[PDB]
């Protein structure tokens, strides 16, 4: 195990379309799937899972190629990866809709499943990432405060494995910078926590998988230009950080173009990493929203 599993939960694997996916699962009741993003694994949910599993069955997979999950066999575009996550969730909730919570590139890798299988998704929570569309081409490369929060899109998408070549052997240093520069509340990223995430992403296939998501980003944008012709109809909630590193008001504003029924919150004093930087208010908002079902 790359990360400690919380009490009452089990680490397990399921093959989906030939790809072995790792997940952690616990609880009883209707299913909620929690999907992590870049720089992290299922473990970013380890503080939400205890309370959430008192009311729901909770499954937190590792994205293909990240954590302990095998890379995808089709590709890394959102529409390709969403197939794996959808079939995984439906293995555990085949006759009933399930809930979805996603963070960062977890959004990219689930939005196509949601729009294409709307009857399978009871309620939806998206936090801290743009849905891939042309609005991402407007984020600035550089700012009057210096280093921007989005230059990594181009670094990671660069050809000839530029990012792996520079970061290999320096994974712990790079990840600490990347995480803390996107955070308002940096203290929660302890030495030990950063060691655990660094060791996981330092696996050569996971370092490369990480950046293949960004190398498929423009393909995902083109896919979503067609998919977004159907608006989402299920109750949705967006969360974004209001501090340094977060999406601020962009998150809810963009989602209004995708979802008929959306409520949004901007969490003060939090950056990009909501489950770790403000576990307490984020957990309450998510649990309350999902418990309306």
């Amino acid at each position, epitope marked *: 195990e790359e990360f400690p599993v919380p009490n009452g939960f089990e680490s397990a694997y399921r093959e989906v379309d030939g790809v072995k996916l790792h997940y952690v699962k616990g609880g009883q009741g209707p299913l909620v799937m929690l999907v992590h993003g870049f720089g992290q694994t299922w473990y970013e949910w380890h503080q939400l899972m205890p309370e959430l599993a008192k009311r729901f069955t909770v499954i937190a997979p590792d994205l293909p190629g990240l954590g302990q999950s095998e890379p995808p066999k089709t590709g890394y575009s959102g529409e390709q990866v969403a197939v794996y996550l959808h079939k995984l969730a439906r293995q555990f909730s085949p006759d009933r809709p399930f809930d979805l919570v996603a963070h960062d590139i977890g959004i990219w890798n689930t939005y196509p499943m949601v729009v294409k299988n709307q009857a399978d998704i009871a309620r939806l929570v998206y936090m801290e990432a*743009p849905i891939p569309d042309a609005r991402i081409y*407007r*984020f*600035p490369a550089f*700012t*009057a*405060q*210096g280093e*921007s*929060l*989005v230059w990594h899109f181009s670094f990671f998408a660069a050809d000839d494995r530029l990012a792996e070549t520079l970061i290999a052997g320096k994974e712990r240093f790079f990840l600490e910078h990347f995480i803390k520069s996107h*955070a*308002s*509340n*940096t*203290e929660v990223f302890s030495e030990r926590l950063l060691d655990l995430y660094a060791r996981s992403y330092a696996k050569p296939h996971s370092l490369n998988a990480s950046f293949e998501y960004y190398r498929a980003l423009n393909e995902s944008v083109r896919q979503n230009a067609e998919l977004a012709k159907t608006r989402l109809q299920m109750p949705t909630m967006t969360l974004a950080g*209001g*501090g*340094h*590193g*977060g*999406m*601020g008001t*962009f998150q809810l504003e963009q989602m209004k173009a995708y979802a008929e029924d959306v409520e949004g919150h901007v969490l*003060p*004093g*939090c*950056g990009h990493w909501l489950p770790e930087e403000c576990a307490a208010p984020m957990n309450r908002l998510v649990i309350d929203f999902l418990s309306r079902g």
Partner: nanobody
Amino acid sequence: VQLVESGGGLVPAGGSLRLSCTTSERAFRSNAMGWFRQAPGKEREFVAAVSVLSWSGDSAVVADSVAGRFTIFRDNAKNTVYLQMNSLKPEDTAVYYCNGASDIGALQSGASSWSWGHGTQVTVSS
């Protein structure tokens, strides 16, 4: 908050000063940072503010009374926000105070994330 406000001085009109406001990292990153000023017996007034950095970028505002003369900028590495004051006038004399809020609009509306500090005294002589 570890608030430190400095840089004020006795300076002749037409001169310049740079004020500095430093706080703890969490306070600085959680808030749009603003400079205010208050002359004794008068209202505190908003001077300038700079938002936190989001993925879309940032924003900054300088009040009309000092636009073209004062500028504001963050040094995120030092958890410090600076007020560059050029072409000072006697009417700029005041104690200058630093504070923060959830966004620039909240600072303009009077919100503050910490109790006001001692400020830094700016005296513009003849």
